[PDB]
Paper text:
RSV F is a class I fusion protein that is expressed as an inactive precursor, F0, which is cleaved at two sites by a furin-like protease, leading to the formation of the disulfide-linked F2 (N-terminal) and F1 (C-terminal) subunits, which associate and trimerize to form the mature prefusion F protein6. The isolated antigen-recognition domains of these unusual antibodies are known as single-domain antibodies (VHHs). Here, we present the isolation and characterization of two llama-derived VHHs that potently neutralize RSV A and B subtypes and selectively bind prefusion F with picomolar affinity. Structural studies reveal that these two VHHs bind to a conserved quaternary epitope composed of two F protomers.
Numbering used by the authors:
A (entry chain A): 27 to 98, 137 to 547
B (entry chain D), E (entry chain F), F (entry chain E): 1 to 52, 52A, 53 to 82, 82A, 82B, 82C, 83 to 100, 100A, ...
C (entry chain C): 27 to 98, 137 to 545
D (entry chain B): 27 to 98, 137 to 549
Write the structure that this text describes.
């Protein structure tokens, strides 16, 4: 039930019918790998199977040592966060004395456990791989003595399989300075993540949302390498919390609106800058100016509140009446009449100017529409591609109804002679403010030059008195008797 | 403006049932999460039940899941925690708390923005 | 053949001699992996080899389930596309009833086939891996009976090799939400891609270009996880179509041009904003403002028309005459005279201002030139590094001749008192327009201000007659006695 | 030791106590893999072990063939470099005739060697893998005769292990067009890198810094696939040189400072635009406007001078006196009073405007502060989260003392009637200049309107003389009665 | 302005030859790709030959390669499809089509911008 | 402005010791790296010793490490290279060179910005 409306008056279009999924918080889980404490591997063995074990054992030791060294348009209006502040904070606590022992003790009889940390935060802990048990019960009995009890080749292979996850986790961290995103399937398998979500302190709706979109969850998660101590390897996995679900969302697309005068460079342009994703949220509207930070899955849209502004709901009025007195709609101005297209949810906006060839075509018919100069729109029904200049655009083929809202392009309401065309970070009122100032100094200064010629100039400065007669200054003596 | 008022605390016998009420005033539920928390003597305060103001979806920790149920009455603007088959270990002060869904960060005591003053529940026998 | 020209007059430089390779369209292919449908794994066996087979077999099953969950400066002037809209459309058709059977039947007797989809689009289809055949002809004998025929260790290794491709493909998609780019060699091996290109409905020129530059082709391609149904794993690979090849390209480099007065608050600056890649294309010029979106291979430049503007060929004029009347060259203005350098194809532009130390050095000789304030240039012949302030730049060592075109820096042609320095998205005509407007407003206002002292004011209102003498009002009474 | 200062007067905050680590140059090393020259794989074999080798041997040949085909806010003020220009130049030299032979002869009896190129450049060389020796001395007996003297699996496994690295290097290069970053552990293991660093021509302090932060070194490195010729695979690894270490660094955080009038369209705003990292460097200050190009490890900050401006040290004055006469502090102006927060090192700046609900909470207490309109700050001491509108921010919990420097917000010093609100790329002096001009035109125009409203119109145009009395023109004759006699 | 006009259709005996012509008016060739397509009765329409206006590079499907050749005469502004050794299966209506190289998306009927009305060719005993 | 002046060169017998001095004028040391280089007859010029102006940290190639030591005297604005247990193969022209730490690119002859004219040592 996705629909779209194009507003001819402002060269913009709104796509609606979307449902929200906003990351509002963070959950920090602690993932642990139980390690084996294996110094020297004393053996003069030169049996191939034992030989393989010594090379693989070295990869295990190397991985541990390596991990040890490690631990010793309007987007510019957005604030600045610290993405892993919560995860790092939990990791800092884990370095405190006794802390690892709590976790290690907790996961003694289960692989999954809730542990309250010393600062009171209750985190879920997960032992996802027990290399300690495997090496001490499989490998350790054979490497016990110099004389080395040779393992079948099939046992050796099994060690490569179990150890491989450790090598890959270490590999990822080594080239990412201990912080990776998205969280790979080495860090956390699907079953592990799914069970994490199930055991999470969240509502059933959230559990349902996260389990059905684990791939998005991975992209919005961080893995933070934290500590290796007392045969415990632990990294914090920071998972997104989605506290806002199923509120209406809409995406605003905008494109330049210019005049179409014959003389090149005599044209003025205007573009709505407030494009991006919008979601109703708690009586206000969450606005994501950089729509590329949001990911759409069917009709569900995943965003991060870290990338939003919180706006009055009156911001929507810019869609119905851009000159409304209640919200000052943001725009940019220019004289740069270049041609382009914006592909929307259910069609395409075309800004065709100058000598550019701009067309829309169908699969079987070929070119079916040639755009005239100006800002226009076509729906994706019966249209497959759009070409503006040398750029071909394939349109989106999703089902849904479009509405073309007619109206005079508002750029026609401006006098090009007082139009501030070089405003980049502007708005409706600011442009008005400047137009009013240029117009004021032209009314008044021209008002003033008129009626200056209406005033009388100075009389002669020769120490003689003058009176006014017939539009000239005449000597006072003239009208006396010499007296 | 914002207030929370728990009521319904009292002495219950083990295996008995009890209903708590939490009256919200000063804000709208739709935009918030409402939670029930409890603190037993000497112990850290722990979550018991969360609900979404909008969807009504709920969260019960493993310890009370099955025995406790949370509900909301839109007409009365009140959130209820029904407690069934009460055990002496459930003796605690029960707190109502809330957080804006915009700021939602889990059903955890460290993830709440407003707190009631509590109501005492005691499961015992003289 | 690469050459370069520096324009002293506008603090900019053009590198030419490049050949185009523009992605103009998309081709969608369907890549398939034939899967085995294996429920329970019957064996009470506790042999290491069958155990290995059972742990590895579980990895195969897990991958399927995981994949199953999966399918349920002037850049701001650019338009906005839907990069995988065409690929997604083909994937959507594949979900339609009867559709997979069409593909599956088509690839019955060959691994390569053209298949017409229900909407008439003919796509190339590729069965790249048959795991169904492998498990049913290799492992079915050991896994499908109580009494279990329980081989040697070389089979365990062997299963891992065939299964590994499936695991890696699955691995990639899980962390990219079903859409990956560049297309890895797990998605599509080198041989597979080359034969795909060979079987593609394109010209020989295109075939030659794509085959000789597969590493670029991969970066401009998409892999779209599409469907798992009826033992078929299928992903759509969206490949670039290069409809423009071997047209001239040139790269415009620009740097800030400021006045150099001693007083720091007295300088004004201007920078050409139209830097980026330019390619002749169909009587017009394709302009790519974000040059990082283009990849250069020797003298071949790969771009995407999705990242271009289509400009009149008169746009070239900004290079020879920035005040030319046929095209309005784009610029920005400021008073921010900070120092920097732009490393070009064949040299380096240095914008050195204020008290900054700016030099150029040789490998063996050390510092060989100290730059004075202003905008200047050096070719890469005999120059190895440039230092501006605390920033060291290594220059490109590619061969080619440079031409230094002298001319007075145009910022000197402007009167700083009416120069608009807070123009961010501007151009030559707009700046000229405001100066004309600022000049209009001081002429008119000074015309007005001149009319202060010459006109006569009111005389006192004290019921006495006054006459005018020596520029002020005097009592008439004064003169009658 | 980390401290922070918040300046209420300018809605900004400086975090200091940091130490520099700046990449100032590049070192180019040459990493080589010695290859086997194996045409046809002569075998009638249908034995499982030899079969594994042919699929694996094919992976080796394919990789070689594949690699062969391969080789056939104020950031906008920054310059533009060529990141791998030095590496490519060294790679270019390796393509010159005779050049590869120099390297190849050098590395026969040792794995590490210094080689001077024809252009005089002396590079460190590393044989990291010898596949030539392995295939030609081990599997060569089964592969060079039709008649095939078979192979066993423990040898097969060993071969898979050794060959795998070649496949991954090729893989990485295949999807990165022969240039990768960060440099992976397939390209260069941790030990390999460490010994490379130890043998590098740099001082000991630098060796220590790089060794304790090898993970950072990797991210600032490039691997450049260079040449395959005469059974030698060689790629250039371009490593960072840190020529500036242990100089003081500080991070400037800024946020919009606006007036707080009730009417939403009546407010004016100001923001310091010069936010980013600052480091003392060689008597000047290196300024990194895009602080995301720097990576922080505890109190050490790694940056790249390629992403900096070089500024006079007087730039620091904008922190102590933003109206100082010695440096023109950069700002932007607008009327867009939207609410936000900047999470600093040791707290949070909150710009809360209009009707936005802005709060700070503690872990156990919940909401503890509601911010009033304006620009404000809270330290991370006793505060865990901040909420501005629908956005929740977690604060950084690092230890350190904050100082709140009180002062009247300077936005109050501007008269909104002459305030230039559409300046994006502006500064204090530029804004001052325009205000002086607007004030100038109001002095003058009011003087003009005054003097004009002061002037009298023309007297009647009849044969009669007029004098001025009581604000009108009166006949001269009126006042002459009495001159006779 | 832009028009395409095919001619040269007729009845041919098997093994015989026929040349079709497509006259372009209203645009220039250099900037375009020219294609020949055919649609036999009841069957979906399929590509036969493409040529680059600029380079003259050509594309022939496997089915006609060797038998069909496409050429262009810049002086006469016309594109030709020579058909040799005609087979009854080649009986079809042959269409001329073109697309700007800027918008090029392959030699496919859905990737063309302008179409002629066609000319019928029949290969019969 | 910037100048370098080496001194202390002369004829030495094998096993003897010699100290060279390099006087800097026109710049300050603190902002620079100071290196000692040598070029023996017919041979390419090679690094010998670097020091940090700021930290005083030093670098010695393997061939002379232990025998050669570099030090700096801030009061005299001069950098010294002490050479112990000299061998005839050390016969070379010894050059003083420097580079700004901002432009630092290793203790390599292609990585220096200013060069003295040298002083000859013969063993
Ligand atoms: C501009 O002036 C007009 C009167 O001509 C007035 O109606 C309008 O409100 C003014 N707008 C602004 C933004 O000052
Ligand atoms: C500026 O004014 C001059 C005359 O003073 C005129 O010749 C020129 O065309 C004008 N240019 C613009 C861009 O207004
Ligand atoms: C503005 O004017 C005042 C006095 O009129 C002067 O002191 C100040 O320096 C001027 N500043 C600028 C930037 O013109």
């Amino acid at each position: 039930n996705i629909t779209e409306e194009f507003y001819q008056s402002t060269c913009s279009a709104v796509s609606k019918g979307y449902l929200s999924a906003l990351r509002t918080g963070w959950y920090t889980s602690v993932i642990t790998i139980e390690l084996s404490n294996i110094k020297e591997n004393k053996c003069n063995g030169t049996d191939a199977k034992v030989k393989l074990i010594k090379q693989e054992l070295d990869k295990y030791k190397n991985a541990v040592t390596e991990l040890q060294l490690l631990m010793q348009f309007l987007g510019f209006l957005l604030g600045v966060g610290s993405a892993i502040a919560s995860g790092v904070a939990v990791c800092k606590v884990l370095h405190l004395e006794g802390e690892v022992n709590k976790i290690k003790s907790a996961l003694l009889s289960t692989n999954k456990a809730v542990v309250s940390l010393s600062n009171g935060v209750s985190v879920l802990t997960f032992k996802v791989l027990d290399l300690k048990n495997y090496i001490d019960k499989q490998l350790l009995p054979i490497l016990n003595k110099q004389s080395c009890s040779i393992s079948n080749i099939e046992t050796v292979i099994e060690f490569q399989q179990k150890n491989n996850r450790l090598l890959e986790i270490t590999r990822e961290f080594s080239v990412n300075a201990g912080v990776t995103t998205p969280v790979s399937t080495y860090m956390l398998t699907n079953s592990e993540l799914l069970s994490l979500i199930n055991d999470m302190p969240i509502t059933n709706d959230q559990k349902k949302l996260m389990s059905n979109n684990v791939q998005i969850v991975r992209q919005q998660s961080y893995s933070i390498m934290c500590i290796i101590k007392e045969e415990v390897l632990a990294y914090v996995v920071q998972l997104p919390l989605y506290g806002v679900i199923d509120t209406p969302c809409w995406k605003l697309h905008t494109s330049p609106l210019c005049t179409t005068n014959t003389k090149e460079g005599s044209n003025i342009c205007l573009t709505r800058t407030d494009r991006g994703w919008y979601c109703d949220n708690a009586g206000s509207v969450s606005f994501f100016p950089q729509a590329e930070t949001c990911k759409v899955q069917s009709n569900r849209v995943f965003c991060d509140t870290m990338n939003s502004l919180t706006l009055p709901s009156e911001v929507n009025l810019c869609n119905v009446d851009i000159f409304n007195p209640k919200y000052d709609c943001k725009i940019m101005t220019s004289k740069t009449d270049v041609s382009s297209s914006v592909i929307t949810s259910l069609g395409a906006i075309v800004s065709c100017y100058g000598k550019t060839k701009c067309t829309a075509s169908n699969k079987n018919r070929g070119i079916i529409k040639t755009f005239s100069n100006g800002c226009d729109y076509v729906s994706n029904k019966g249209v497959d591609t759009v070409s503006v200049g040398n750029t071909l655009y394939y349109v989106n083929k999703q089902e849904g109804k479009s509405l073309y809202v007619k109206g005079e392009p508002i750029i026609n309401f401006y006098d090009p002679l007082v139009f501030p065309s070089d405003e980049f970070d502007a708005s409706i009122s600011q442009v008005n403010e400047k137009i009013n100032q240029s117009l004021a100094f032209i009314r008044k200064s021209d008002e003033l030059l008129s009626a200056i010629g209406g005033y009388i100039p100075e009389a002669p400065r020769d120490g003689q008195a003058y009176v006014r007669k017939d539009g000239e200054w005449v000597l006072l003596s003239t009208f006396l008797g010499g007296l | 403006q914002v207030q929370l008022q728990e009521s319904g605390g009292g002495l219950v016998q083990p295996g008995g049932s009890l209903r708590l009420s939490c009256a919200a005033s000063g804000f709208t539920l739709d935009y918030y999460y409402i939670g029930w928390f409890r603190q037993a003597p000497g112990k850290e305060r722990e979550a018991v039940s969360c609900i979404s103001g909008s969807s009504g979806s709920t969260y019960y920790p493993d310890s009370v899941k099955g025995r406790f149920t949370i509900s909301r009455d839109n007409a009365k603007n009140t959130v209820y925690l029904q407690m069934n088959s009460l055990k002496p270990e459930d003796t605690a002060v029960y707190y109502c708390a809330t957080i804006r869904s915009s700021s939602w960060g889990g059903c955890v005591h460290y993830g709440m923005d407003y707190w009631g003053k509590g109501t005492q529940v005691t499961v015992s026998s003289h």
